[PDB]
Design a protein around this ligand. Structure first.
Ligand SMILES: *C(=O)CCCCCCCCCCCCC
Ligand SMILES: *C(=O)CCCCCCCCCCCCC
Lengths: 604, 109, 41, 604, 604, 41
């Protein structure tokens, strides 16, 4: 049973309506199922432990028995009259609301009390590493004590109550074994209150540490089910939400990104220059679109973000072409009639809006750093919005210069300030971008081995690629973490892949002389580096031309392997290299024993 | 006492440090303001000169301070308070405790 | 380390005590007590 | 009850003082509460499973019953005489210390034993993805077997014991259903020992996966309470500790950062040059402070860190002004009399200490990379300390050049090596920095919408801004993760904000014609992108001029929403887009069924 | 007991063979141990809660009692005949397979049902932050309701069932206290079904929050045992696997990295130029090895990776030396006879392979960005493999230019395209690299204070240094997180170190006048910044010349402290600064009360 | 908010209801139910 206890308000006959939460002057009795007593007992148990320090310091008020907050009522206990009717409990143990209040504020008040002392006990305890993980190692008690008698700073609490803290301590450190009163010798065994827990944390030499290897697994299992690593290369529309894209604002360096390497950025590849004009704040400036191609951020295929083009440390040659100086650098949109990459001359450019200029010309924004005047780090920045560009077939964001007077000097300059580190930040997660279009769902499998070397590094913050990369990255840490894809152990991961290579290379051999019986020693090893190359750089699985990894099978395969692989690790997964791991722990205890030996001499 | 309703801060307010993170819309320095000027061995006017501004910063709309200034008369009580005029100071029970004072007009302005 | 006597069953400076870690019993108390909504009930 | 068992040493009457830990020749009996038997049973259960492999290989020693390590003593069981008095347990089940030792080293020894085999069983099991997540899919057993008879490398253990591993396997993979002996046909149902657990992990088509959606929530709940996301925009002094700043060493590019964009960096904006001198290692060099403003790291407002100015790949024009070559580049402090930004000429600069020079002039540190000789990657580096600058009102760290002989050539150079990538690393977490001052506590709400575009990116490693950014970043991953702030589901997050916008826009309408009744469809949508823009780039909420996000309400609001939102997710939160998610899983099982079909043909 | 139930197939006498899983027409009865009923009850309990909404909307089918899926069989219940023999259970409660199916698909079907409604209830609940964390704060109900009557968008479900959702709600938000029918007033206490859980999550003013502080500890404990932070500075061979290196592809900028600062990169420091030739694709090009030293990636000491040298934004002076234009930039290997750094002239260079050229000369790859033509972002890229360089003592990877015709113009150019951002990605984790050699195991302690300032930042992706950095980094977040290494609390971490400094400085004082009695106030403070400097920048502990941190004791010491420190935190660790933390929470509730006050007026 | 009457023990617009958060009872249902393999059994 569970929930609050109910009782037949109509008396005797208890039906699915003659019940009612048995409330009263104390609040409502909620049932205390077996396991929920484990907690409140485990919590109180950790407080009672500090008994010797509560009396010493006259705080506290006696040991807290959980049997002081409960009661022994009886009735039907469920979550609702209907279902509570199927849990007739007699003399169960319930805790009334007003009690659920004290057991709370008591464990809270006492928790402070101890939390404090417990902190002093520690700066003194750990102040001599009472924990080794291979074999033993003593340190003659006299010295030890006479030593901490020093180190411990005058405001601890282990100097005001030595054997009032010691008695608390003995129950937390199975290192300190108190000398028995009637034989005046230790005990071999150490009996700290955490008897079992402390036994099951020792780094057992057979397998690393059960508490470790156990969690590193349940931890990975969490992720595997959580983010949705499963279904990682699913071939079908998936809401961007399914990718929980967060804290995702990637930055670049356009005016370098080739147009074909990333759809969201077209260029004005035209013969001559395209000097246009525009009255901005009265003054008339001339946008240039200089000698080179001047790659500009396209506006369509640009998920309403927060574009913030930073222009700093980048050269600013106002020294040579004086034409450049005087011009306030500024991010400006450019609506063109004919599609760009077909826009020849000025009459082609519909209009030009200065979405964000920089007050003060190019001769105050400068700063000489050895001849080559740089740009005082400043951030121009628009706030592009999907629909502010409705209809408008062609429009481009360009972080240019806005020259107040074009001249012969700036005839080979080309004032694109795009060489600066632009940082787009998708401000509306629901919508992603792929191959130049804005969508609401991705098709994972499509984005695999479909980008090129740099059609990946040139991805646009929160676009399929960047999403089908953030995803693999989780799955990449589950294998990297739990599975042993980094040793000659032909693990579950590199194993799922090997079976694909076989089934694959086996049918490609079917029909024709079949002169080559499948290899296997070579297949195991080829798939080992395939699974390994993945854990290594999760990204690669997106680039066209990557051995194994990019065939449709793998990944879809890998994950579902790694999947079941985590759901069976056992507990002693740590047996892997638990030999050198062990031998390394003994190595430490031998060096730490060496320490105790000095504590033992210096302070005799 | 419920933490939300009653709070307790240790250390004196005479020291600049104490005023970090203590914001109350109203302060009351009754029975202390006189002892602080004496404890910090400082002039009464000069003392409140540094306290009032702290209460303003502390975010205070109202103030009540049991200052000890002879606003009615510079006349004193034979056994209760002696008004040493060489040095602006009182003597509650002549000796039992000595605390500097201000004048009605100077302290007022 | 001044002698106490009964407050607690052990004296610190008491006769034959012994600091001596054993890889076997990693000291512990109870930190990870579960209280999260679903798990506490 | 819990803890070690005690018994009346004084006999009969137990008075809370009579009781003593019932120790003896076996150690101390510690009680084995109901739940703690669940673990040791669940641990032993996972070992017994491997019974068929223990006999086959003559290891092991029979099935391990947990009832072999316990006993049936009876007495009072608590943590201390006082509280143990309230737990009279009769014939409880306790495990003695020396036993708590075997149940430990047995589960450890056996755990190794199985951990090994269990690894072989796997490279063979996952080596044919026995796990699908939508509908079924078989693969005629003959083929399957005759297939793995191949792939499996000659050193497995699934080839030496086929149906000795198979029997272990059948209990772990409800995929392999053994053919019943007396009807020689499968069973429809599959009965693996993990009957329930395996049932509750299947990706249930109604809602993603209970095991997933459940954890992704408890996981977020952990963080929410842990780091202290709650109280994220609290308006009142908070110890830096409350922000657990760790692994926090940010790097820049000064000599670019404007002085007003980041208080910790002032500049010598003076008319002419300020050539000073200083005997460093005998030789007399001249610090320049050349033509430009030469931005220098201020020393006050500089949390005793580890400044490490790297100067590499950056230009080094010793080719033109020969003056530059011969000068050993070096980070140097500069104490000035009059405050900088008021320091006109040499007589103003008190002294200049070469806190770290680079041995060998500027013509060995070079390296030609196409005409423009660069700087061989080298790291100069001081170790500034709060108090080494006590009293000293003005002092600045400057990574300049130290020219051995100033000339006309270096009259427009300005040797500030600050254009290099400097990396400050706060070496003393307790102290933070804000607006130019060093403090011990932040006031969160103060740092919101108080920085500018770049008064953020120019923050100083472990300063309020960088702390009130590391914090939002956690809270940003709790929403990004748990809450669905990335779909049209007007989630709890974007909902907490909408209620603020209403209450806000509603009172701004009070008093005056109230010609505009609040919108709502427009408010919901405006707050959706507000909560969304946050998850996106957590930082923004610090920059002055960000719609919604920067009003005092939000955040303080958001978090406390997201807060309660996680504490109610239910379990089936995965119902979100659990349709396409499902349809994608069927998509995979259809492709994986396609695989089994080849395994089924190629190897008949 | 646990597992499936068995019964004596041979009847009466139940031996370790006369048993057999009691299967049948329903599947196999698996035992439902005490705790496993807690879950299925806790799951069903959370569904029954939504009873009022199931009837309202005619879905559901009555309350789901867990006692409808189980049974009361009796027999022996274990994991295998052998061990099941020691668990005779009478009238235990087992759930048959076919049932373990419904309790599953029911909780799944119902889970969807509620998951939906439960989402509507929320957008409305959190839409008025029903959760404060200090003191109370009301908001006159009328207003509140009449308010949400607005905000809530027309497609919720809290408008179609107000007090059908309200009744569900009252059990989840102890904020909404329903007015009692027979006294028509609230209740003071609030009785939500989560009575206890909700009591134990409140931010208790004594210590932050038990649910928080508890997890932040168990969380850290997980890591500490997991990754293997323990043994962090172990002095003995450790398989790279023990470091779970994943998602590890670091990028650089060679042609800058000094050869001695990173063994994996030697340079051709020769007097004149070394123009060689090579027929690549018919056309004959000349590799240059120009004027400067031209640092090249060495091939040995290069873990078979995926070298991808990006050349973008970097200068391309085809404007001056016309010689440069026309030459296709390309990454090329260079096998030399005599070891490099001893290779004088052309006859010395055995052969030169163009492992990856860039189609199209240097005058299409350009792009004018203000005079200085840059490189259109493109990625050349080899796939170096350990053994493809077997025997071959000397061979180097060089991303040079391949000039189609060397001239006088390119006599001081030196076409090394290495100034570009190269990104090596280890494609085979098992093998690491150290000091220039490829290995399979590291020796941790060796890599401490053994690298120089930049012999660290110049590390090669997945090399000991980068591994002995990824490791410290975990341990750095465990302390940063759990332990308070960021306040004057002389924590367990900075305490473990202090004891080393003492024992160390104490013996260095032994022998000779011992004129200096150890300090301690100065030692505590010195070790505090030592432990602090570590949490800060984990890396440092690798660099030669770091105070304290780099002595062999520390770290090996630190960790083992931090270790036991986490295994005792208590629960109320949050007591740290739980004063200002509290005062900040009251600060928020005072501001949130201010909000409710407007909701209370505007919508009267 | 239209009156219902019996469907559920409380009317929403019912007499004397009261929204009033208390730092003491942080509202929470059951999200973190443990189901992971080892822990569910
Ligand atoms: C008398 O108090 C002399 C000092 C000896 C003990 C003081 C505290 C240092 C030793 C701690 C013992 C309890 C657990 C560390
Ligand atoms: C009648 O339905 C008028 C609207 C009043 C309540 C509608 C929903 C808003 C209040 C929610 C109450 C239940 C939990 C939020």
């Amino acid at each position: 049973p569970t929930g609050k206890l109910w009782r037949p308000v109509g008396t005797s006959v208890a039906t699915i309506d003659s019940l009612a939460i048995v409330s009263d002057r104390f609040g409502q009795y909620s049932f205390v199922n077996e396991g929920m007593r484990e907690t409140f007992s485990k919590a109180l148990f950790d407080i009672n432990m500090w008994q010797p320090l509560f009396q010493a310091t006259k705080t506290g008020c006696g040991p807290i028995v959980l049997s002081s907050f409960t009661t022994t009522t009886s009735g039907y206990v469920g979550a609702t009259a209907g279902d509570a009717l199927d849990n007739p409990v007699t003399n169960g143990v319930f805790i009334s609301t007003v009690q659920i209040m004290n057991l709370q504020r008591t464990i809270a008040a006492r928790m402070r009390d101890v939390a404090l002392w417990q902190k002093h006990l520690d700066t003194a305890m750990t102040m001599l590493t009472p924990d080794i993980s291979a074999g033993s190692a003593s340190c003659n008690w006299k010295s030890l004590l006479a030593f901490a008698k020093d180190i411990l700073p005058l405001d601890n609490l282990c100097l005001t109550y030595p054997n009032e803290f010691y008695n608390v301590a003995i129950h937390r450190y199975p290192a300190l074994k108190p000398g028995n009163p009637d034989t005046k010798l230790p005990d071999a065994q150490a009996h700290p209150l955490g008897e079992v827990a402390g036994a099951f944390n020792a780094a057992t030499s057979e397998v690393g540490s059960l508490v470790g290897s156990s969690s590193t697994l349940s931890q990975a299992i969490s992720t595997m089910a959580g983010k949705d690593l499963d279904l990682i290369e699913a071939d079908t529309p998936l809401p961007v939400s399914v990718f929980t894209p967060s804290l995702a604002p990637r930055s670049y360096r356009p005016a370098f990104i080739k147009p074909e390497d990333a759809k969201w950025i077209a260029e004005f590849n035209n013969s001559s220059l395209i000097r246009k004009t525009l009255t901005y704040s009265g003054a008339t400036y001339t946008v240039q679109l200089g000698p080179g191609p001047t790659r500009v951020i396209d506006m369509n295929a640009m998920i309403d973000s927060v574009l913030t083009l930073d222009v700093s440390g980048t050269i600013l040659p106002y020294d040579t072409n004086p034409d450049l100086s005087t011009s306030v650098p500024a991010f400006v949109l450019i609506q063109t009639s004919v599609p760009i990459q077909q826009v020849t001359t000025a009459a082609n450019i519909t209009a030009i809006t200065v979405v964000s200029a920089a007050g003060a010309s190019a001769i105050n924004l400068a700063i000489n750093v050895r001849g080559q005047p740089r740009f005082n780090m400043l951030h121009l920045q628009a706030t592009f919005e999907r629909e502010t560009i409705t209809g408008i077939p062609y429009i481009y964001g360009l972080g240019t210069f806005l020259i107040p007077s074009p001249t012969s000097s700036s005839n080979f300059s080309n004032p694109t300030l795009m060489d600066g580190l632009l940082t787009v930040t998708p401000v509306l997660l629901r919508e992603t971008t792929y191959k130049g279009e804005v969508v609401d769902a991705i098709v994972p499998a499509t984005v695999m081995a479909n980008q090129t070397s740099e059609e990946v590094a040139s991805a646009l913050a929160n676009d399929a690629i960047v999403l089908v990369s953030n995803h693999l990255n989780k799955l990449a840490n589950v294998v990297g973490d739990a599975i042993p894809v980094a040793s000659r152990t032909d693990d579950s991961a590199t194993s799922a892949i090997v079976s694909r290579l076989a089934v694959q290379h086996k049918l490609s051999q079917v029909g024709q002389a079949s002169p080559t019986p499948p290899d296997y020693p070579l297949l195991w090893r080829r798939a080992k580096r395939a699974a390994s190359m993945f854990v290594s750089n999760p990204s690669l699985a997106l680039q066209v031309g990557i051995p194994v990894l990019t065939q449709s099978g793998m990944l879809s395969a890998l994950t579902s392997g790694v999947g079941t692989a985590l759901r069976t690790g056992s507990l002693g997964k740590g047996v892997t290299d638990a030999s050198e791991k062990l031998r390394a722990r003994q190595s430490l205890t031998v060096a730490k024993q060496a320490f105790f030996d000095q504590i033992g001499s210096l302070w005799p | 006492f419920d933490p939300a309703l009653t709070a307790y801060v240790q250390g004196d307010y005479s020291t600049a440090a104490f005023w970090n993170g203590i914001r109350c819309d109203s302060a009351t320095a009754i029975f202390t303001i006189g002892a602080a000027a004496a404890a910090a061995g400082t002039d009464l006017i000069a003392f409140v000169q540094q306290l009032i501004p702290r209460i303003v910063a502390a975010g205070g709309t109202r103030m009540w301070l049991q200052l000890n200034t002879p606003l009615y008369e510079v006349s004193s009580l034979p056994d209760l308070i002696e008004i040493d005029l060489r040095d602006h100071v009182y003597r509650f029970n002549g000796g039992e405790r000595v605390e500097p004072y201000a004048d009605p007009v100077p302290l007022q302005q | 380390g001044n002698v106490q006597t009964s407050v607690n069953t052990y004296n610190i400076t008491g006769d034959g005590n012994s600091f001596t870690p054993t890889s076997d019993m990693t000291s512990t108390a109870a930190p990870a007590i579960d209280l999260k909504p679903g798990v506490l009930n």
